[PDB]
Amino acid sequence: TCPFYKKIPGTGFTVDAFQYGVVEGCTAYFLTHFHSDHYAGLSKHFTFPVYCSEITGNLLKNKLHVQEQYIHPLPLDTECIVNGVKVVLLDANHCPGAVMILFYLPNGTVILHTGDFRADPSMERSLLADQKVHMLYLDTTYCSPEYTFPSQQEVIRFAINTAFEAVTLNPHALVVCGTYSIGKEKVFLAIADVLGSKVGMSQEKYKTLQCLNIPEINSLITTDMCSSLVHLLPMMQINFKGLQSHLKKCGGKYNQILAFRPTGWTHSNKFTRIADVIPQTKGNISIYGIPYSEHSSYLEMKRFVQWLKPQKIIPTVNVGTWKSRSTMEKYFREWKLEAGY
Numbered sequence: 507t508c509p510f511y512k513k514i515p516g517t518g519f520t521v522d523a524f525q526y527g528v529v530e531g532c533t534a535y536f537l538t539h540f541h542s543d544h545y546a547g548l549s550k551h552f553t554f555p556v557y558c559s560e561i562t563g564n565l566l567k568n569k570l571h572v573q574e575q576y577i578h579p580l581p582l583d584t585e586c587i588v589n590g591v592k593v594v595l596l597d598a599n600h601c602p603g604a605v606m607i608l609f610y611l612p613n614g615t616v617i618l619h620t621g622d623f624r625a626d627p628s629m630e631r632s633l634l635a636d637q638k639v640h641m642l643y644l645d646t647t648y649c650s651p652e653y654t655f656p657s658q659q660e661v662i663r664f665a666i667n668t669a670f671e672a673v674t675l676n677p678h679a680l681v682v683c684g685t686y687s688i689g690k691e692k693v694f695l696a697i698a699d700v701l702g703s704k705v706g707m708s709q710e711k712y713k714t715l716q717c718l719n720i721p722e723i724n725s726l727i728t729t730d731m732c733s734s735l736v737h738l739l740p741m742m743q744i745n746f747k748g749l750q751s752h753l754k755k756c757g758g759k760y761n762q763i764l765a766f767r768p769t770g771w772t773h774s775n776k777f778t779r780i781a782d783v784i785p786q787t788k789g790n791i792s793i794y795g796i797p798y799s800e801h802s803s804y805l806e807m808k809r810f811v812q813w814l815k816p817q818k819i820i821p822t823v824n825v826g827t828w829k830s831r832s833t834m835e836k837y838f839r840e841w842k843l844e845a846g847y
């Protein structure tokens with residue numbers, strides 16, 4: 507049974523609600539982004555209208571085989587009428603194709619559902635500037651002040667400088683980057699650009715990247731592993747055993763691996779600056795964990811919410827424990843008293 511925080515009152519609509527069977531009353535199912543916790547339940551046998559971005563629609567058709575007749579793509583930043591209700595899709599600054607949804611209810615209530623997002627000051631100059639929001643359905647993944655991490659630009663700078671130094675010292679080093687979902691593509695694209703290489707990967711991953719509308723993608727990626735000195739591998743293989751096994755397969759072309767694991771936040775963020783990050787090393791293999799986040803930090807979240815001034819907040823992450831729920835409610839009240847709304 508579908509939980510309350512996935513239903514939009516006063517509508518026939520649900521958000522990210524495909525794992526509950528046929529939801530009673532639902533005439534349109536919205537999907538914010540193509541991550542498995544959110545699409546859980548969709549397949550080629552789905553027969554209800556799905557509303558989403560163009561990029562999400564490419565992935566539903568090619569990767570999950572949903573039939574074309576049930577995929578409804580909408581442009582961003584554009585007022586659209588769906589089943590008699592005005593909606594707008596906004597870029598979420600999450601993974602490719604990820605959106606927030608603004609719903610203009612027939613009674614005059616305005617609701618924003620963030621999906622998953624990384625709040626940014628640029629959002630304060632979207633179509634959100636123009637009007638009031640009564641209810642905010644909020645991605646609260648990192649809603650606690652311990653959750654700190656650097657900008658995505660600082661992280662990429664570290665990765666580019668690290669890879670370029672290592673391969674200039676040893677032209678026989680291979681770079682490997684882990685992946686397990688869409689998102690975080692800048693990590694491997696930026697490193698391959700500094701090295702003058704295409705990114706090599708499996709046919710399955712190549713297929714996924716070809717759905718993302720990235721400009722000039724055919725110039726940037728390949729399935730010919732022998733021609734590339736940046737390889738992608740599943741995240742589960744980014745360990746000393748898996749990397750050893752990979753280096754064997756490269757026919758004596760390489761004598762060293764430098765690997766990256768993009769994570770979210772980890773507790774070593776509570777001690778170490780990005781500049782001071784060091785790898786784990788065994789013999790001719792080194793592994794960097796780098797804190798490349800596609801979710802808001804606590805301070806980014808707080809800023810966004812204090813600017814929007816919603817009347818009510820409904821968390822969509824960390825909702826399963828009383829301790830989490832109580833912690834989040836406390837910070838919402840602090841934020842409101844401090845800003846005066």
Ligand code: NI
Binds near residue numbers: 539
């Ligand atoms: Ni996500």
